[PDB]
Design a protein around this ligand. Sequence first.
Ligand SMILES: CC1(C)S[C@@H]2[C@H](NC(=O)CCC[C@H](N)C(=O)O)C(=O)N2[C@H]1C(=O)O
Ligand SMILES: [Fe+2]
Length: 327
Amino acid sequence: SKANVPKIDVSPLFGDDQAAKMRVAQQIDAASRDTGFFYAVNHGINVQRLSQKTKEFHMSITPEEKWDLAIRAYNKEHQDQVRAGYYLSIPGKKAVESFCYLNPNFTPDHPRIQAKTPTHEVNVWPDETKHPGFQDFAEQYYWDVFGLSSALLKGYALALGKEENFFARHFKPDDTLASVVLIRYPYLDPYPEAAIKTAADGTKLSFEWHEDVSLITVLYQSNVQNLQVETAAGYQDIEADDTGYLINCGSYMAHLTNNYYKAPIHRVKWVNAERQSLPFFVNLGYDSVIDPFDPREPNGKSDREPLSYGDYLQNGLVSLINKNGQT
Ligand SMILES: CC1(C)S[C@@H]2[C@H](NC(=O)CCC[C@H](N)C(=O)O)C(=O)N2[C@H]1C(=O)O
Ligand SMILES: [Fe+2]
């Protein structure tokens, strides 16, 4: 059965028509209370070019380069790379591979880098001559999707009865913990069975059920259907749409809203197809704390304790590896 995933024209969130912004907020509210997914359309980002530049990267990087960029899970020499870098495939065992990068403003002179604060790292990049234009393209993409995400956060805020900068004031270029992951799901013949997981209902999967570790997740994927969302009605297929961004809440949103906006449980079906999954995880700053609330209660009070974003994030990232494995 197909999940209800509405297409929402988010362009008013970039402008000054406040009533039009409220009508978008209502759609976000409805989707958030239903399956928890929607497609953002009329978002302004050139996703075809994103896909093409990502393809050029994934198909030309070499094994040597992958070792040289590898996170510490794959390369013991890179002890500072917990988040940022290359996540290698393991032919015959693990099909997916990916490249993660963080805020380009996390430079060696950034105060959180100097302090060695958890979850902050300086990005690693391949050689420019081997991948001309890639670093520059990827850094600008970070800021293009940052901008889209800021507009979406205005929509969420309004949807929850707040002023539009409720979330966005904690989402800032100098300190956001947001990440881009460029994931390659390959076509393989034969496809290794160890890379295929099986759900309790029999569905072959590439990644097991989870909630995202994010405030919201802003995802581009190729036009190959693969995601499913759990609803009271069972797991439902999310249709692909390679012209839109698939949006959903992460568990920090669920905490902040006392589950009024749940972090939907979702999973990735196994498909033997060469495709791309390019999430942007919208994370706040390390010390950002928003007081939890509950938009279902007249006084809006919640019995949840405030949680800093950095505490959330550090704990969540490890937990997800422990539950569904090292990606
Ligand atoms: C379904 C997803 C988009 S979300 C799910 C899974 N998510 C993660 O591993 C989180 C990675 C966070 C990142 N390294 C960081 O440091 O910020 C992943 O990747 N999966 C994607 C996929 O498999 O397509
Ligand atoms: Fe996810």
